[PDB]
Amino acid sequence: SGFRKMAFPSGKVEGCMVQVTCGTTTLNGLWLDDVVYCPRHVICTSEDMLNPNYEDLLIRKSNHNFLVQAGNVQLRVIGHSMQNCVLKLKVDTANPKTPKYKFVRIQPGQTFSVLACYNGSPSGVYQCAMRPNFTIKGSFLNGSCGSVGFNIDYDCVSFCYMHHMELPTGVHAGTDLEGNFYGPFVDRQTAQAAGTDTTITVNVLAWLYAAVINGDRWFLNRFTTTLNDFNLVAMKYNYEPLTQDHVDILGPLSAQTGIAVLDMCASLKELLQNGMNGRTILGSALLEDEFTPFDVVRQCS
Amino acid sequence: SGFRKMAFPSGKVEGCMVQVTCGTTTLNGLWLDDVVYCPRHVICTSEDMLNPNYEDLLIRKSNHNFLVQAGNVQLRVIGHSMQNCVLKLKVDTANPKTPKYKFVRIQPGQTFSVLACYNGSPSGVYQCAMRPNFTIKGSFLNGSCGSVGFNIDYDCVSFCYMHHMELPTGVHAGTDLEGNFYGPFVDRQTAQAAGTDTTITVNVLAWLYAAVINGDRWFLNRFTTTLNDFNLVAMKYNYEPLTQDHVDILGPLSAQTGIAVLDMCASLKELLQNGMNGRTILGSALLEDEFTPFDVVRQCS
Numbered sequence: 339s340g341f342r343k344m345a346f347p348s349g350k351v352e353g354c355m356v357q358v359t360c361g362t363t364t365l366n367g368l369w370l371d372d373v374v375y376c377p378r379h380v381i382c383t384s385e386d387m388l389n390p391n392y393e394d395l396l397i398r399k400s401n402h403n404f405l406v407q408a409g410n411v412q413l414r415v416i417g418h419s420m421q422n423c424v425l426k427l428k429v430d431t432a433n434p435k436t437p438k439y440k441f442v443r444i445q446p447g448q449t450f451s452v453l454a455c456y457n458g459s460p461s462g463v464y465q466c467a468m469r470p471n472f473t474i475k476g477s478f479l480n481g482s483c484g485s486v487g488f489n490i491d492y493d494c495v496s497f498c499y500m501h502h503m504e505l506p507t508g509v510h511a512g513t514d515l516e517g518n519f520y521g522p523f524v525d526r527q528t529a530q531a532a533g534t535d536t537t538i539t540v541n542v543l544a545w546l547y548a549a550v551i552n553g554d555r556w557f558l559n560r561f562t563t564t565l566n567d568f569n570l571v572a573m574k575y576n577y578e579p580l581t582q583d584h585v586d587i588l589g590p591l592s593a594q595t596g597i598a599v600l601d602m603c604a605s606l607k608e609l610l611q612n613g614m615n616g617r618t619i620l621g622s623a624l625l626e627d628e629f630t631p632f633d634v635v636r637q638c639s
Numbered sequence: 640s641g642f643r644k645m646a647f648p649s650g651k652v653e654g655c656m657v658q659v660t661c662g663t664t665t666l667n668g669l670w671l672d673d674v675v676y677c678p679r680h681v682i683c684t685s686e687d688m689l690n691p692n693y694e695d696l697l698i699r700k701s702n703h704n705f706l707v708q709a710g711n712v713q714l715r716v717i718g719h720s721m722q723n724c725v726l727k728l729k730v731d732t733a734n735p736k737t738p739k740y741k742f743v744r745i746q747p748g749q750t751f752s753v754l755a756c757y758n759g760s761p762s763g764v765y766q767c768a769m770r771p772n773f774t775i776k777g778s779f780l781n782g783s784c785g786s787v788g789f790n791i792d793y794d795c796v797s798f799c800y801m802h803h804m805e806l807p808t809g810v811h812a813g814t815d816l817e818g819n820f821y822g823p824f825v826d827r828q829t830a831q832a833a834g835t836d837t838t839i840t841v842n843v844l845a846w847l848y849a850a851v852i853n854g855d856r857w858f859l860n861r862f863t864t865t866l867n868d869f870n871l872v873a874m875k876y877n878y879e880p881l882t883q884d885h886v887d888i889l890g891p892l893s894a895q896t897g898i899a900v901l902d903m904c905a906s907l908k909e910l911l912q913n914g915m916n917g918r919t920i921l922g923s924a925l926l927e928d929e930f931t932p933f934d935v936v937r938q939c940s
């Protein structure tokens with residue numbers, strides 16, 4: 339039992355968080371070597387926020403218009419540039435806490451840890467997934483703009499998300515570390531809707547394996563399905579397609595539990611068609627889709 | 640949007656984790672100033688684990704029998720002692736990463752972050768609550784013994800839990816940092832059952848306040864109750880009775896919403912006696928009991 343969302347230890351990222359201020363507009367930045375990365379929205383006044391022309395706004399700024407603080411210590415800005423929606427401020431000191439790192443762009447269904455920060459100060463850490471509609475269902479308050487998402491492999495931090503905004507529905511939108519949005523969003527304070535979301539099938543199946551590993555098996559059956567027939571039903575219920583690569587990735591969980599991937603698909607099909615009849619799985623009344631196969635193996639070994 | 644389990648940033652604790660080995664028995668320790676704290680179980684060989692005589696096992700050990708490692712760097716042990724179920728190994732180097740810290744003993748219902756560690760290496764962080772039966776529904780594998788639980792207030796780390804063992808039901812038991820077990824458990828490899836658990840009433844009330852803050856308030860009724868009357872009913876539904884301290888910690892939420900604590904108790908009483916009539920609260924048909932009043936204020940404000 340005890341299977342739960344588990345984040346990566348955040349220390350390597352905490353050592354990189356700073357505050358960036360332009361006028362009275364302020365947010366979080368990420369300090370790696372001698373460069374601070376942050377949302378370019380920081381350059382906007384409250385009027386500019388509504389409909390910014392970023393190239394015009396930026397040409398009207400010099401290095402001295404940017405105040406960067408690492409805790410209480412001011413870092414002097416000696417260059418600036420913009421890459422898509424990300425501002426890069428070159429500073430005159432290298433961050434000694436810089437971890438080994440990469441910038442990566444993730445795919446829908448992939449999970450990451452978020453270090454929520456306020457005015458350059460880390461506040462909390464939790465796991466999220468990239469939704470099929472390219473939103474994230476985060477927990478973020480005012481002042482969180484510029485908080486990052488990441489995975490850690492060995493000692494290497496792969497940064498995948500920089501937080502920009504909350505949409506009217508309460509879900510979140512942001513960019514990769516090259517400043518390209520996930521999804522059809524723009525860095526402007528105007529109401530924006532997302533596309534209709536879908537459920538991440540491969541993750542639901544991973545979580546059903548986690549449930550079996552933890553002794554919860556009521557949902558298993560003896561029905562069988564082909565991959566095609568499973569996918570027909572999945573599509574009907576606004577579930578993402580399950581690919582042969584997904585089947586392959588679920589191989590280790592299948593081996594560990596002795597439940598064939600397609601038999602687990604048959605179980606899921608019946609849950610979609612029948613519902614849960616007031617029962618829970620791993621304490622949940624809903625089918626959970628924010629654990630990847632990797633997440634499950636990592637936590638269960 | 641919504642509420643989720645959120646951990647504190649783990650960096651301050653990561654910098655204190657070490658590995659402690661005695662013979663082939665190995666687990667995690669906590670390095671603060673020039674002392675490493677770890678479960679005294681480390682001094683057991685396999686043959687000692689069932690019925691250890693700790694005083695006898697310890698008299699036969701010298702400083703030179705303890706291998707304490709920060710990564711692959713050995714820290715030389717210069718003293719050893721036992722305090723309850725914790726071993727304290729004085730080392731010749733003060734940890735430069737020691738945060739401001741306190742040792743605290745928590746009550747049932749209180750939440751904390753767990754930094755799960757293996758062989759002195761942090762692996763993941765998640766939030767947990769102490770159950771009324773003094774177990775935690777954690778996520779731990781073999782090699783996790785000595786992982787710690789903590790809260791961070793300002794820049795001070797309050798350590799509250801040191802993990803020792805997994806019980807037959809898959810829940811977890813451990814000590815405070817003074818080595819006193821939470822609950823009726825002992826540090827021996829014997830099957831030990833937890834007492835029957837109950838629902839954490841103060842946290843359910845915090846959850847209801849969270850729902851009201853978010854405009855979901857169908858369950859507010861025209862009635863009130865005394866604390867005594869409420870407690871007597873609570874017990875009939877396997878809910879914890881409230882203490883005076885519980886009433887007090889609900890004060891900020893009560894003030895924020897203008898809903899008196901006892902009026903909320905009356906609302907909860909109606910839910911216990913009547914059920915939910917097919918309705919949900921914060922999207923769920925189940926009442927959440929692992930968010931404290933502090934957790935609610937942290938996530939809302």
Ligand SMILES: Cn1cnc(Cn2c(=O)nc(Nc3cc4cn(C)nc4cc3Cl)n(Cc3cc(F)c(F)cc3F)c2=O)n1
Pocket residue numbers: 362363364365377379380478479480481482483502503504524525526527528
């Ligand atoms: C509730 N919530 C959840 N996530 C967020 C993220 N977020 C944020 O923290 N701040 C925003 N706008 C700003 C206002 C400022 C006022 N001052 C003095 N300084 C400010 C700095 C910022 Cl960034 N926004 C809104 C927002 C941010 C963008 F980057 C963007 F492109 C469009 C937007 F509408 C925000 O969502 N808030």
Ligand SMILES: Cn1cnc(Cn2c(=O)nc(Nc3cc4cn(C)nc4cc3Cl)n(Cc3cc(F)c(F)cc3F)c2=O)n1
Pocket residue numbers: 663664665666678680681779780781782783784803804805825826827828829
């Ligand atoms: C599945 N699970 C979840 N939590 C735990 C924690 N846990 C643990 O990590 N290890 C334990 N026993 C050891 C065996 C060792 C073998 N080697 C080579 N070194 C070892 C060191 C330890 Cl600590 N235990 C069992 C256990 C540990 C105690 F501290 C105790 F007092 C009683 C116990 F039964 C364990 O639960 N495993």
